[PDB]
Amino acid sequence: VVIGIVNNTVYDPLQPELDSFKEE
Amino acid sequence: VVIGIVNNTVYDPLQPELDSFKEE
Numbered sequence: 644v645v646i647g648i649v650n651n652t653v654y655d656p657l658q659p660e661l662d663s664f665k666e667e
Numbered sequence: 668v669v670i671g672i673v674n675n676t677v678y679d680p681l682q683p684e685l686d687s688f689k690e691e
């Protein structure tokens with residue numbers, strides 16, 4: 644719906660904790 | 668860098684949940 648939008652990734656601080664818990 | 672900074676702890680509302688969840 645927005646003109647001029649650009650593809651990119653947005654970092655999320657929770658996922659590193661999710662991975663850390665899965666490792667442990 | 669900052670002049671007059673003071674040592675202290677900053678509480679994180681998320682970590683305690685994973686600490687409680689860890690042992691399971």
Ligand SMILES: *[C@@H]1O[C@H](CO)[C@@H](O[C@@H]2O[C@H](CO)[C@@H](O)[C@H](O)[C@H]2NC(C)=O)[C@H](O)[C@H]1NC(C)=O
Pocket residue numbers: 648649650
């Ligand atoms: C951003 O990336 C998505 C894919 O991740 C692009 O979406 C594709 O666009 C092409 C051409 O319009 C379509 O044929 C595909 O079906 C689309 N795929 C999906 C999953 O949507 C999108 O065009 C990209 N946009 C920009 C500005 O680069």
Ligand SMILES: *[C@@H]1O[C@H](CO)[C@@H](O[C@@H]2O[C@H](CO)[C@@H](O)[C@H](O)[C@H]2NC(C)=O)[C@H](O)[C@H]1NC(C)=O
Pocket residue numbers: 672673674
């Ligand atoms: C805050 O505490 C840290 C230690 O947790 C202090 O850092 C030490 O400072 C002394 C003296 O400058 C050094 O000899 C040590 O090597 C430092 N250790 C570390 C880990 O940094 C710091 O000075 C304290 N700051 C205040 C304002 O109290």
Ligand SMILES: *[C@@H]1O[C@H](CO)[C@@H](O)[C@H](O)[C@H]1NC(C)=O
Pocket residue numbers: 646647
């Ligand atoms: C910006 O201007 C160029 C001129 O060639 C055009 O191709 C492009 O689509 C325009 N994009 C936006 C977001 O205005």
Ligand SMILES: *[C@@H]1O[C@H](CO)[C@@H](O)[C@H](O)[C@H]1NC(C)=O
Pocket residue numbers: 670671
């Ligand atoms: C505040 O003033 C005192 C005066 O004795 C000085 O010792 C101290 O370093 C000063 N601290 C700051 C942050 O201005």
